Design a protein around this ligand. Structure first.
Ligand SMILES: *[C@@H]1O[C@@H](CO)[C@@H](O[C@@H]2O[C@H](CO)[C@@H](O)[C@H](O)[C@H]2NC(C)=O)[C@H](O)[C@H]1NC(C)=O
Ligand SMILES: *[C@@H]1O[C@H](CO)[C@@H](O[C@@H]2O[C@H](CO)[C@@H](O)[C@H](O)[C@H]2NC(C)=O)[C@H](O)[C@H]1NC(C)=O
Ligand SMILES: *[C@@H]1O[C@H](CO)[C@@H](O)[C@H](O)[C@H]1NC(C)=O
Length: 863
């Protein structure tokens, strides 16, 4: 055996020969570091029994275990393989127990397949029988994508494992972790997945969410594929340099999907087609968000709001953390420290801003006739709590307010209880959106206030390498009971069900509106309901750096609205770090400055009315706001087609192997390259400039660089921002709120490619109504430049903004002097616009023009 292909047979202890012999595995301690000493033999596991059966959907096979005494509990002697050719580019197979039903994820979006195998498959599937393996190859070039033959299938009641060889080491995805780089380290790495409230630090632990999807770029042609495991039990994923990946889970079934595409963006599109495309955000949620844990009093909160408004900082959203509550209890506010909370909210609204309030899932069980607590009383009447293993007594744990019970959001009546809590509280405080936190679910005691019984659920045969080494650590007992099943099976689904329920609440509380939900814990599919933030980071330069792969991975996962706490939640932030982070932070899809309890202020205005940090912050936030129409259109494409929003360079530049591991730079969509300074003391950044024409965003000048590493000069007040030739970017003059900015004139920036062509598009709707896309109430136009001519072409025209918006400026980059500019409307001329030309920079600006939004125009020039 090649040592890189050994599949570790002793994942559960230090390897020894005795155990190896006992398990019937192979023993060879003569390998390199991390190479498994004890590994599976060539004939371990299952074989196909008899013949495969053609079905309407694909085929089934019966798999029979070649006998062996129990290692990690009761083995499954007869396995059923069911394979479904669901679409031309999506294959589904599951391995179940022939004789017994087992837990299967009750996903809100994925449905079972009915009817017949798709025609025109891009993939071919091959089963081997002695021993069992499954292989998926790309039909066009015979590339083997999925091939399980490298290792055994293991299928015990609490230990399920399958491995696959990979065509390349360009592997991206899995979560939620701090990987520290974007392209996977394939050198014997294990990543546990089990939702858990822990710090996103350098330790490589399981964090708040569970994401099994990864994407593999097969080669420079762009051909790519993805694999998703629909399984919500604690699990770990093991990467090795064969290259290969192994999924090892402690329950449920092995339910896999394989996705093929011609490009990385196509794989993401196929994945999101299956699990659910992300929600289209409220346009205001794309503005800047400010927050902290423990303003302490409303006066303090209002003081921060007011200095940042007086600074003229673009600033749409204020979040209120648990300090607003009465003794950290949901659905109350502190009538002394937060006295006047409703008036303050009116003041936010009057200034065009929005209030987002935190809501935790755990509910104080401290209620008496003397001092009742309505949410507990109402929830108990509805009997909607998670129960102890007895099935009938609500489980008791401890969170912010003290002893608490936990809502069972898998119960349909829990969403009705939850909705009523919000409608009641909203009548007192008119919040605009909801931040759901501690929803792993996070418990300050292990399991419950009485601990956990010793049983195969709380103390399973195998425990993946999760933080602290026990499943119920800082969460619920694994034998706790909910409508969807036992905690052991549904733990990873708690935050997911909470988001579904919260989205359900929003149908009543904000009728017909998208509102905004931000969640900590996620499962596959969570992006359909909620934004995500990367959690309780730290004010260090490492955390700044680690944020970029985190944002990119969540964009693969269909949660494009994701960002960390800008400036760092834990710790006082240094001015230089916070300045650099604010600069980068202006370009995260979710942009929120958030700070932990007790640390020095890190709101931009706190650094000084005339400070460099505040000037640079306002500068780059104004750029962000100017580009909101482009960012919003990217979100429209995520929502409607499944595209990423913050995008790895490799998704556009995959033909260039220099981009395959780039993670200190990223794109907005196809067209905008962001190059932050990420090193302490630095005024330069080593950056890659891909193989395109690029223009400096601010000056419009063409950089000399192309397809090369450069040291980009970036002084204290600068971040690198470059526009890609070939693309047209719609813009709107900024203001300090999106409420106000949406009323301003629009602009186009045309970045010409080598052929003096460019293309772009603009989506426009009312920015807040839910399902404007499904119900087709929007504007979509296309811009295309092909020498001497700009065409504005309208493809969907069912929204007309009543604010009478128009493009009143067109900036053309990389152009020779335009002359004799004409404007035709519906092909009818026409008014002669002003043109300014900078011959040194090759930039033309067309002004004194008024192209109505939603109308077709031709603009033409000579040279
Ligand atoms: C950005 O914001 C708005 C409102 O916040 C707007 O202010 C208004 O502008 C009008 C002057 O042209 C006034 O008639 C009106 O009283 C004023 N309201 C205020 C200050 O509360 C700004 O004009 C707008 N500016 C930009 C650049 O779009
Ligand atoms: C948790 O325990 C409660 C009892 O405290 C269960 O409540 C039941 O709720 C249903 C639906 O309203 C009623 O029809 C039952 O009669 C209730 N039982 C009792 C004993 O009062 C609830 O079902 C439990 N939840 C789970 C998931 O087991
Ligand atoms: C890992 O966690 C420990 C606490 O167990 C912490 O002190 C340490 O700094 C973390 N390591 C890294 C590399 O961030």
């Amino acid at each position: 055996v090649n040592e890189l292909e050994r599949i570790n047979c002793i994942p559960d202890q230090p390897p020894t020969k005795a155990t190896c012999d006992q398990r019937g595995c192979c023993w060879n301690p003569q390998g390199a570091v991390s190479v498994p000493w004890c590994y599976y033999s060539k004939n371990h596991s299952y074989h196909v029994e008899g013949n495969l059966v053609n079905t309407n959907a694909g085929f089934t096979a019966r798999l029979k275990n070649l006998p062996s005494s129990p290692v990690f509990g009761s083995n499954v002697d007869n396995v059923l393989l069911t394979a479904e050719y669901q679409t031309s580019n999506r294959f589904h197979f599951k391995l179940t127990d022939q004789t017994n039903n087992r837990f299967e994820v009750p996903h809100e979006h994925v449905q079972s397949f009915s009817g017949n195998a798709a025609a025109s498959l891009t993939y071919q599937v091959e089963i081997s029988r002695q021993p069992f393996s499954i292989k998926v190859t790309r039909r066009s070039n015979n590339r083997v994508l999925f091939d399980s033959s490298i290792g055994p299938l293991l299928f015990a009641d609490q230990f399920l494992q399958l491995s696959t060889r990979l065509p390349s080491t360009n592997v991206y995805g899995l979560g939620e972790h701090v990987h520290q780089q974007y392209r996977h380290d394939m050198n014997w790495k294990t990543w546990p997945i089990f939702n858990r409230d822990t710090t996103p630090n350098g330790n490589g632990t399981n964090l708040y969410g569970a994401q099994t999807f990864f994407l593999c770029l097969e080669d420079a042609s762009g051909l790519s594929f993805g694999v998703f495991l629909m399984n919500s039990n604690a699990m770990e994923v093991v990467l090795q340099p064969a290259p290969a990946i192994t999924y090892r889970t402690i329950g449920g079934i092995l339910d896999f999907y394989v996705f093929l595409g011609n490009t990385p963006e196509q794989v993401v599109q196929e994945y999101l087609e299956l699990i659910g495309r992300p929600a289209l955000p409220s346009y205001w949620a794309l503005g800047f968000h400010l927050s902290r844990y423990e303003y302490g009093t409303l006066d303090n909160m209002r003081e921060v709001v007011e200095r940042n408004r007086a600074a003229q900082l673009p600033y749409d959203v204020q979040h209120a953390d648990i300090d607003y509550m009465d003794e950290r209890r949901d659905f109350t506010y502190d009538s002394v420290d937060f006295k006047g909370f409703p008036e303050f909210v009116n003041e936010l609204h009057n200034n065009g801003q929005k209030l987002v309030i935190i809501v935790d899932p755990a509910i104080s069980n401290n209620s008496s006739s003397s001092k009742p607590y309505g949410p507990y009383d109402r929830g108990s009447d509805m009997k909607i709590w998670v129960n102890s293993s007895d099935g009938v007594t609500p489980l008791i744990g401890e969170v912010w307010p003290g002893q608490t019970v936990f809502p069972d959001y898998t119960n349909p009546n829990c969403a009705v209880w939850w909705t009523k809590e919000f409608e009641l509280f909203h009548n007192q405080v008119e919040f605009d959106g909801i931040w759901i936190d501690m929803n792993e679910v996070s418990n300050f005691v292990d399991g419950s206030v009485s601990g956990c019984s010793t049983n195969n659920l709380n103390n399973p045969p195998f425990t993946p390498r999760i933080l602290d080494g026990y499943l119920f650590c800082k969460t619920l007992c694994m034998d706790a009971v909910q409508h969807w099943g036992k905690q052991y099976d549904i733990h990873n689904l708690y935050g997911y069900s909470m988001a579904v329920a919260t989205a359900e609440a929003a149908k009543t509380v904000f009728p017909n509106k998208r509102s905004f939900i931000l969640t900590r814990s996620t499962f596959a599919g969570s992006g359909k309901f909620a934004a995500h933030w990367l959690g309780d980071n730290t004010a260090t330069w490492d955390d700044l750096r680690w944020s970029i792969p985190g944002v990119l991975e969540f964009n693969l996962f269909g949660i494009p609205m994701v960002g960390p706490d800008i400036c760092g939640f834990a710790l006082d932030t240094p001015e230089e770090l916070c300045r650099r982070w604010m600069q980068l932070g202006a370009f995260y899809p979710f942009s929120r400055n958030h700070n932990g309890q007790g640390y020095k202020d890190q709101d931009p205005a706190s650094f000084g009315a005339d400070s460099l940090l505040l000037n640079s912050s306002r500068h780059y936030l104004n750029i962000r706001y100017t580009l909101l129409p482009y960012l919003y259109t990217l979100f429209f494409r995520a929502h409607s087609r499944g595209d990423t929003v913050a995008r790895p360079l490799l998704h556009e530049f995959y033909e260039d192997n220099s981009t395959w591991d780039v993670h200190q730079q990223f794109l907005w969509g196809p067209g905008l390259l962001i190059t932050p300074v990420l090193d302490e003391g630095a005024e330069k950044v080593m950056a890659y400039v891909p193989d395109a024409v690029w223009y400096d965003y601010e000056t419009g000048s063409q950089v000399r660089w192309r397809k090369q590493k450069v040291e980009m000069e970036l002084p204290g007040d600068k971040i690198g921002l470059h526009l890609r030739g070939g693309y047209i970017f719609p813009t709107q003059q900024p203001n300090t709120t999106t409420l106000a900015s949406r009323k301003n004139p629009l602009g186009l920036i045309i970045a010409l490619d080598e052929n003096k062509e460019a293309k772009g598009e603009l989506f426009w709707d009312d920015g807040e109504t839910k399902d404007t896309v499904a119900n087709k109430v929007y504007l979509l136009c296309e811009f295309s430049v092909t020498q001497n001519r700009l065409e504005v072409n309208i493809s969907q025209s069912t929204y007309k903004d009543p604010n009478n918006l128009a493009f009143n400026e067109i900036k053309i980059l990389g152009t020779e002097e335009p002359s004799n500019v004409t404007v035709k409307h519906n092909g009818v001329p026409s008014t002669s616009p002003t043109v300014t030309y900078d011959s040194n920079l090759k930039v033309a600006i067309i002004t004194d023009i008024d192209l109505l939004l939603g109308e077709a125009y031709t603009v033409e020039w000579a040279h």
